[PDB]
mmCIF file of all heavy atoms in Angstrom:
data_model
loop_
_atom_site.group_PDB
_atom_site.id
_atom_site.type_symbol
_atom_site.label_atom_id
_atom_site.label_comp_id
_atom_site.label_asym_id
_atom_site.label_seq_id
_atom_site.Cartn_x
_atom_site.Cartn_y
_atom_site.Cartn_z
ATOM 1 N N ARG A 48 -0.352 5.130 -1.977
ATOM 2 C CA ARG A 48 -0.508 5.366 -0.590
ATOM 3 C C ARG A 48 0.909 5.610 -0.070
ATOM 4 O O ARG A 48 1.817 4.836 -0.385
ATOM 5 C CB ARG A 48 -1.057 4.029 -0.028
ATOM 6 C CG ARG A 48 -1.333 4.054 1.382
ATOM 7 C CD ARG A 48 -1.237 2.604 1.834
ATOM 8 N NE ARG A 48 -1.846 2.621 3.061
ATOM 9 C CZ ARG A 48 -2.154 1.606 3.842
ATOM 10 N NH1 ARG A 48 -1.746 0.397 3.674
ATOM 11 N NH2 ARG A 48 -2.847 1.910 4.919
ATOM 12 N N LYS A 49 1.094 6.660 0.665
ATOM 13 C CA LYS A 49 2.254 6.857 1.468
ATOM 14 C C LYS A 49 2.076 6.062 2.783
ATOM 15 O O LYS A 49 0.926 5.754 3.179
ATOM 16 C CB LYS A 49 2.402 8.346 1.813
ATOM 17 C CG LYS A 49 2.539 9.253 0.558
ATOM 18 C CD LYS A 49 3.645 8.777 -0.413
ATOM 19 C CE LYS A 49 3.604 9.627 -1.714
ATOM 20 N NZ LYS A 49 3.063 10.999 -1.337
ATOM 21 N N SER A 50 3.157 5.676 3.416
ATOM 22 C CA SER A 50 3.038 5.059 4.751
ATOM 23 C C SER A 50 3.981 5.751 5.675
ATOM 24 O O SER A 50 5.116 6.114 5.303
ATOM 25 C CB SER A 50 3.336 3.572 4.675
ATOM 26 O OG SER A 50 3.318 3.026 5.966
ATOM 27 N N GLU A 51 3.513 5.922 6.907
ATOM 28 C CA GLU A 51 4.329 6.473 7.927
ATOM 29 C C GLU A 51 5.621 5.656 8.066
ATOM 30 O O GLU A 51 6.664 6.196 8.495
ATOM 31 C CB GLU A 51 3.517 6.534 9.251
ATOM 32 C CG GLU A 51 2.179 7.372 9.080
ATOM 33 C CD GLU A 51 0.917 6.547 8.514
ATOM 34 O OE1 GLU A 51 1.070 5.449 7.887
ATOM 35 O OE2 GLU A 51 -0.276 7.025 8.712
ATOM 36 N N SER A 52 5.611 4.384 7.669
ATOM 37 C CA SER A 52 6.750 3.568 7.891
ATOM 38 C C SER A 52 8.015 3.903 7.077
ATOM 39 O O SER A 52 9.105 3.356 7.366
ATOM 40 C CB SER A 52 6.446 2.080 7.764
ATOM 41 O OG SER A 52 6.259 1.734 6.409
ATOM 42 N N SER A 53 7.893 4.732 6.022
ATOM 43 C CA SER A 53 9.067 5.049 5.166
ATOM 44 C C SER A 53 9.757 6.266 5.728
ATOM 45 O O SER A 53 10.865 6.622 5.315
ATOM 46 C CB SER A 53 8.635 5.310 3.701
ATOM 47 O OG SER A 53 7.605 6.282 3.721
ATOM 48 N N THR A 54 9.131 6.884 6.717
ATOM 49 C CA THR A 54 9.774 7.925 7.545
ATOM 50 C C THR A 54 10.273 7.348 8.852
ATOM 51 O O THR A 54 9.481 6.727 9.547
ATOM 52 C CB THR A 54 8.781 9.055 7.844
ATOM 53 O OG1 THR A 54 8.510 9.690 6.600
ATOM 54 C CG2 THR A 54 9.375 10.109 8.772
ATOM 55 N N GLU A 55 11.548 7.561 9.204
ATOM 56 C CA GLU A 55 12.125 7.070 10.465
ATOM 57 C C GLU A 55 11.830 5.614 10.543
ATOM 58 O O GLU A 55 11.271 5.159 11.557
ATOM 59 C CB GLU A 55 11.490 7.713 11.737
ATOM 60 C CG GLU A 55 11.207 9.271 11.847
ATOM 61 C CD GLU A 55 12.455 10.138 11.762
ATOM 62 O OE1 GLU A 55 13.567 9.601 11.787
ATOM 63 O OE2 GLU A 55 12.287 11.383 11.660
ATOM 64 N N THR A 56 12.086 4.890 9.461
ATOM 65 C CA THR A 56 11.863 3.467 9.350
ATOM 66 C C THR A 56 12.511 2.726 10.532
ATOM 67 O O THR A 56 11.891 1.806 11.080
ATOM 68 C CB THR A 56 12.301 2.926 7.995
ATOM 69 O OG1 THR A 56 11.656 3.769 6.981
ATOM 70 C CG2 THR A 56 11.854 1.478 7.811
ATOM 71 N N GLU A 57 13.682 3.168 10.962
ATOM 72 C CA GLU A 57 14.436 2.437 11.954
ATOM 73 C C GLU A 57 13.707 2.483 13.329
ATOM 74 O O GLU A 57 14.054 1.724 14.216
ATOM 75 C CB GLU A 57 15.873 3.030 12.056
ATOM 76 C CG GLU A 57 15.862 4.544 12.513
ATOM 77 C CD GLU A 57 15.434 5.587 11.357
ATOM 78 O OE1 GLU A 57 15.438 5.215 10.117
ATOM 79 O OE2 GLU A 57 15.118 6.769 11.734
ATOM 80 N N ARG A 58 12.657 3.316 13.450
ATOM 81 C CA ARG A 58 11.938 3.487 14.703
ATOM 82 C C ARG A 58 10.807 2.488 14.798
ATOM 83 O O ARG A 58 10.196 2.343 15.793
ATOM 84 C CB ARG A 58 11.399 4.920 14.811
ATOM 85 C CG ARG A 58 12.594 5.954 14.929
ATOM 86 C CD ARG A 58 12.216 7.149 15.730
ATOM 87 N NE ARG A 58 13.360 7.758 16.387
ATOM 88 C CZ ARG A 58 13.983 8.841 15.937
ATOM 89 N NH1 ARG A 58 13.594 9.445 14.813
ATOM 90 N NH2 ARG A 58 15.011 9.337 16.612
ATOM 91 N N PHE A 59 10.574 1.769 13.717
ATOM 92 C CA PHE A 59 9.414 0.852 13.694
ATOM 93 C C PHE A 59 9.893 -0.440 14.188
ATOM 94 O O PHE A 59 10.979 -0.924 13.828
ATOM 95 C CB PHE A 59 8.914 0.664 12.323
ATOM 96 C CG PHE A 59 8.104 1.809 11.835
ATOM 97 C CD1 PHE A 59 8.685 3.052 11.555
ATOM 98 C CD2 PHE A 59 6.701 1.690 11.717
ATOM 99 C CE1 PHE A 59 7.873 4.127 11.136
ATOM 100 C CE2 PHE A 59 5.899 2.766 11.296
ATOM 101 C CZ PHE A 59 6.491 3.985 11.008
ATOM 102 N N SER A 60 9.086 -0.985 15.023
ATOM 103 C CA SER A 60 9.430 -2.275 15.656
ATOM 104 C C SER A 60 8.604 -3.269 14.902
ATOM 105 O O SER A 60 8.717 -4.451 15.084
ATOM 106 C CB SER A 60 8.949 -2.136 17.103
ATOM 107 O OG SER A 60 7.527 -2.195 17.140
ATOM 108 N N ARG A 61 7.663 -2.783 14.069
ATOM 109 C CA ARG A 61 6.969 -3.729 13.196
ATOM 110 C C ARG A 61 6.426 -2.992 11.984
ATOM 111 O O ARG A 61 5.824 -1.910 12.094
ATOM 112 C CB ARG A 61 5.756 -4.283 13.961
ATOM 113 C CG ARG A 61 4.889 -5.217 13.169
ATOM 114 C CD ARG A 61 3.514 -5.345 13.963
ATOM 115 N NE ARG A 61 2.653 -6.162 13.184
ATOM 116 C CZ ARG A 61 2.820 -7.467 13.089
ATOM 117 N NH1 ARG A 61 3.749 -8.058 13.808
ATOM 118 N NH2 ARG A 61 2.000 -8.232 12.309
ATOM 119 N N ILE A 62 6.659 -3.566 10.813
ATOM 120 C CA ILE A 62 6.119 -2.948 9.604
ATOM 121 C C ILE A 62 5.532 -4.032 8.770
ATOM 122 O O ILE A 62 6.195 -4.989 8.441
ATOM 123 C CB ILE A 62 7.265 -2.352 8.755
ATOM 124 C CG1 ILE A 62 7.912 -1.236 9.524
ATOM 125 C CG2 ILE A 62 6.747 -1.809 7.341
ATOM 126 C CD1 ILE A 62 9.212 -0.726 8.841
ATOM 127 N N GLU A 63 4.301 -3.860 8.347
ATOM 128 C CA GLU A 63 3.736 -4.833 7.424
ATOM 129 C C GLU A 63 2.646 -4.139 6.588
ATOM 130 O O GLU A 63 2.137 -4.731 5.675
ATOM 131 C CB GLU A 63 3.115 -6.002 8.141
ATOM 132 C CG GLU A 63 2.092 -5.511 9.182
ATOM 133 C CD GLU A 63 1.265 -6.655 9.735
ATOM 134 O OE1 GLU A 63 1.198 -7.680 9.080
ATOM 135 O OE2 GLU A 63 0.669 -6.515 10.815
ATOM 136 N N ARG A 64 2.263 -2.896 6.891
ATOM 137 C CA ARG A 64 1.195 -2.319 6.062
ATOM 138 C C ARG A 64 1.751 -2.052 4.688
ATOM 139 O O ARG A 64 2.870 -1.528 4.582
ATOM 140 C CB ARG A 64 0.737 -1.038 6.683
ATOM 141 C CG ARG A 64 -0.169 -1.305 7.930
ATOM 142 C CD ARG A 64 -0.221 -0.099 8.760
ATOM 143 N NE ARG A 64 -0.964 0.882 8.061
ATOM 144 C CZ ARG A 64 -0.546 2.111 7.793
ATOM 145 N NH1 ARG A 64 0.685 2.529 8.084
ATOM 146 N NH2 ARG A 64 -1.388 2.901 7.164
ATOM 147 N N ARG A 65 0.978 -2.396 3.646
ATOM 148 C CA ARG A 65 1.557 -2.253 2.254
ATOM 149 C C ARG A 65 1.272 -0.869 1.802
ATOM 150 O O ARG A 65 0.253 -0.270 2.256
ATOM 151 C CB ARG A 65 0.984 -3.292 1.257
ATOM 152 C CG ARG A 65 1.071 -4.741 1.700
ATOM 153 C CD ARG A 65 2.517 -5.070 1.872
ATOM 154 N NE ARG A 65 2.777 -6.461 2.250
ATOM 155 C CZ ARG A 65 1.851 -7.441 2.270
ATOM 156 N NH1 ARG A 65 0.564 -7.209 1.991
ATOM 157 N NH2 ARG A 65 2.264 -8.633 2.601
ATOM 158 N N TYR A 66 2.093 -0.322 0.947
ATOM 159 C CA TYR A 66 1.832 1.002 0.437
ATOM 160 C C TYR A 66 2.506 1.227 -0.891
ATOM 161 O O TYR A 66 3.062 0.300 -1.431
ATOM 162 C CB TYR A 66 2.289 2.064 1.443
ATOM 163 C CG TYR A 66 3.749 2.018 1.732
ATOM 164 C CD1 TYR A 66 4.632 2.928 1.178
ATOM 165 C CD2 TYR A 66 4.277 1.044 2.598
ATOM 166 C CE1 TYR A 66 6.010 2.861 1.459
ATOM 167 C CE2 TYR A 66 5.655 0.967 2.872
ATOM 168 C CZ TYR A 66 6.519 1.907 2.333
ATOM 169 O OH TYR A 66 7.860 1.842 2.620
ATOM 170 N N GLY A 67 2.530 2.437 -1.393
ATOM 171 C CA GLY A 67 3.165 2.666 -2.693
ATOM 172 C C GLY A 67 2.051 2.711 -3.670
ATOM 173 O O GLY A 67 0.892 2.995 -3.277
ATOM 174 N N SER A 68 2.362 2.470 -4.944
ATOM 175 C CA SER A 68 1.381 2.677 -5.996
ATOM 176 C C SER A 68 0.619 1.397 -6.061
ATOM 177 O O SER A 68 1.128 0.334 -5.698
ATOM 178 C CB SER A 68 2.063 2.964 -7.370
ATOM 179 O OG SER A 68 3.457 3.160 -7.149
ATOM 180 N N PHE A 69 -0.635 1.479 -6.518
ATOM 181 C CA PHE A 69 -1.295 0.289 -6.828
ATOM 182 C C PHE A 69 -1.970 0.538 -8.139
ATOM 183 O O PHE A 69 -2.215 1.665 -8.463
ATOM 184 C CB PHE A 69 -2.351 -0.076 -5.767
ATOM 185 C CG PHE A 69 -3.404 0.971 -5.616
ATOM 186 C CD1 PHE A 69 -4.607 0.854 -6.273
ATOM 187 C CD2 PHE A 69 -3.222 2.030 -4.753
ATOM 188 C CE1 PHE A 69 -5.624 1.795 -6.119
ATOM 189 C CE2 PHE A 69 -4.225 2.958 -4.583
ATOM 190 C CZ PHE A 69 -5.433 2.853 -5.296
ATOM 191 N N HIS A 70 -2.238 -0.501 -8.893
ATOM 192 C CA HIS A 70 -3.012 -0.280 -10.072
ATOM 193 C C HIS A 70 -3.675 -1.615 -10.311
ATOM 194 O O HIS A 70 -3.024 -2.581 -10.556
ATOM 195 C CB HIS A 70 -2.117 0.026 -11.262
ATOM 196 C CG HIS A 70 -2.920 0.285 -12.486
ATOM 197 N ND1 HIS A 70 -2.386 0.762 -13.682
ATOM 198 C CD2 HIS A 70 -4.250 0.210 -12.701
ATOM 199 C CE1 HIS A 70 -3.343 0.918 -14.558
ATOM 200 N NE2 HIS A 70 -4.492 0.590 -13.997
ATOM 201 N N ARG A 71 -5.000 -1.698 -10.189
ATOM 202 C CA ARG A 71 -5.579 -3.002 -10.491
ATOM 203 C C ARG A 71 -6.598 -2.818 -11.574
ATOM 204 O O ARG A 71 -7.228 -1.731 -11.630
ATOM 205 C CB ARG A 71 -6.258 -3.653 -9.261
ATOM 206 C CG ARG A 71 -5.214 -3.907 -8.141
ATOM 207 C CD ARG A 71 -5.853 -4.776 -7.032
ATOM 208 N NE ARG A 71 -5.959 -6.157 -7.465
ATOM 209 C CZ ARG A 71 -6.775 -7.054 -6.907
ATOM 210 N NH1 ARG A 71 -7.573 -6.737 -5.887
ATOM 211 N NH2 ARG A 71 -6.845 -8.254 -7.388
ATOM 212 N N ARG A 72 -6.804 -3.842 -12.351
ATOM 213 C CA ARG A 72 -7.749 -3.754 -13.453
ATOM 214 C C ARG A 72 -8.695 -4.924 -13.329
ATOM 215 O O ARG A 72 -8.266 -5.972 -13.027
ATOM 216 C CB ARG A 72 -6.986 -3.904 -14.754
ATOM 217 C CG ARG A 72 -6.173 -2.744 -15.064
ATOM 218 C CD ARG A 72 -5.195 -3.281 -16.165
ATOM 219 N NE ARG A 72 -4.166 -2.313 -16.536
ATOM 220 C CZ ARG A 72 -2.961 -2.274 -15.975
ATOM 221 N NH1 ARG A 72 -2.663 -3.176 -15.041
ATOM 222 N NH2 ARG A 72 -2.030 -1.400 -16.395
ATOM 223 N N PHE A 73 -9.992 -4.687 -13.574
ATOM 224 C CA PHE A 73 -11.008 -5.737 -13.529
ATOM 225 C C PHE A 73 -11.863 -5.712 -14.764
ATOM 226 O O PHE A 73 -12.721 -4.803 -14.870
ATOM 227 C CB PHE A 73 -11.857 -5.524 -12.272
ATOM 228 C CG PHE A 73 -11.023 -5.459 -11.048
ATOM 229 C CD1 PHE A 73 -10.566 -4.242 -10.572
ATOM 230 C CD2 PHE A 73 -10.559 -6.603 -10.447
ATOM 231 C CE1 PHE A 73 -9.788 -4.202 -9.392
ATOM 232 C CE2 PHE A 73 -9.702 -6.572 -9.330
ATOM 233 C CZ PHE A 73 -9.320 -5.375 -8.827
ATOM 234 N N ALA A 74 -11.624 -6.604 -15.718
ATOM 235 C CA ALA A 74 -12.600 -6.762 -16.841
ATOM 236 C C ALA A 74 -13.972 -7.031 -16.249
ATOM 237 O O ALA A 74 -14.119 -7.870 -15.369
ATOM 238 C CB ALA A 74 -12.179 -7.942 -17.811
ATOM 239 N N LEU A 75 -14.999 -6.290 -16.700
ATOM 240 C CA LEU A 75 -16.362 -6.614 -16.251
ATOM 241 C C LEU A 75 -17.158 -7.115 -17.424
ATOM 242 O O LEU A 75 -16.765 -6.892 -18.559
ATOM 243 C CB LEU A 75 -17.111 -5.401 -15.638
ATOM 244 C CG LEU A 75 -16.383 -4.742 -14.438
ATOM 245 C CD1 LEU A 75 -17.043 -3.369 -14.230
ATOM 246 C CD2 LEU A 75 -16.486 -5.623 -13.219
ATOM 247 N N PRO A 76 -18.281 -7.752 -17.170
ATOM 248 C CA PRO A 76 -19.118 -8.199 -18.342
ATOM 249 C C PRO A 76 -19.476 -7.011 -19.224
ATOM 250 O O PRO A 76 -19.475 -5.890 -18.766
ATOM 251 C CB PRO A 76 -20.357 -8.751 -17.657
ATOM 252 C CG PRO A 76 -19.791 -9.273 -16.365
ATOM 253 C CD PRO A 76 -18.892 -8.128 -15.917
ATOM 254 N N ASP A 77 -19.848 -7.316 -20.460
ATOM 255 C CA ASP A 77 -20.207 -6.285 -21.458
ATOM 256 C C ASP A 77 -21.414 -5.508 -21.039
ATOM 257 O O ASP A 77 -21.581 -4.390 -21.502
ATOM 258 C CB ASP A 77 -20.518 -6.903 -22.827
ATOM 259 C CG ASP A 77 -19.300 -7.435 -23.493
ATOM 260 O OD1 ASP A 77 -18.169 -7.047 -23.048
ATOM 261 O OD2 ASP A 77 -19.408 -8.202 -24.469
ATOM 262 N N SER A 78 -22.246 -6.079 -20.160
ATOM 263 C CA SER A 78 -23.362 -5.341 -19.623
ATOM 264 C C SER A 78 -22.928 -4.094 -18.829
ATOM 265 O O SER A 78 -23.747 -3.161 -18.574
ATOM 266 C CB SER A 78 -24.226 -6.207 -18.755
ATOM 267 O OG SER A 78 -23.536 -6.681 -17.619
ATOM 268 N N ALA A 79 -21.670 -4.068 -18.360
ATOM 269 C CA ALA A 79 -21.240 -2.995 -17.448
ATOM 270 C C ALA A 79 -21.170 -1.716 -18.269
ATOM 271 O O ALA A 79 -20.579 -1.709 -19.335
ATOM 272 C CB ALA A 79 -19.858 -3.315 -16.834
#
């Protein structure tokens, strides 16, 4: 995810939305 906050960062009076790459993995039961 890109975030508007990495552009003109100094203009933000608040930043907390997370962004960047994510990669999550979820083992599921063998039935899946």
Side-chain angles (χ1 to χ4, degrees):
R48 182 206 196 173
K49 302 307 174 29
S50 176
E51 303 85 340
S52 74
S53 52
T54 293
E55 314 298 351
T56 307
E57 61 285 343
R58 294 211 152 100
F59 282 71
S60 73
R61 176 196 177 75
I62 295 172
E63 54 169 338
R64 284 162 69 234
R65 307 298 183 9
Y66 60 103
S68 349
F69 60 95
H70 181 171
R71 298 191 74 198
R72 289 163 186 95
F73 305 93
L75 301 166
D77 289 345
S78 62

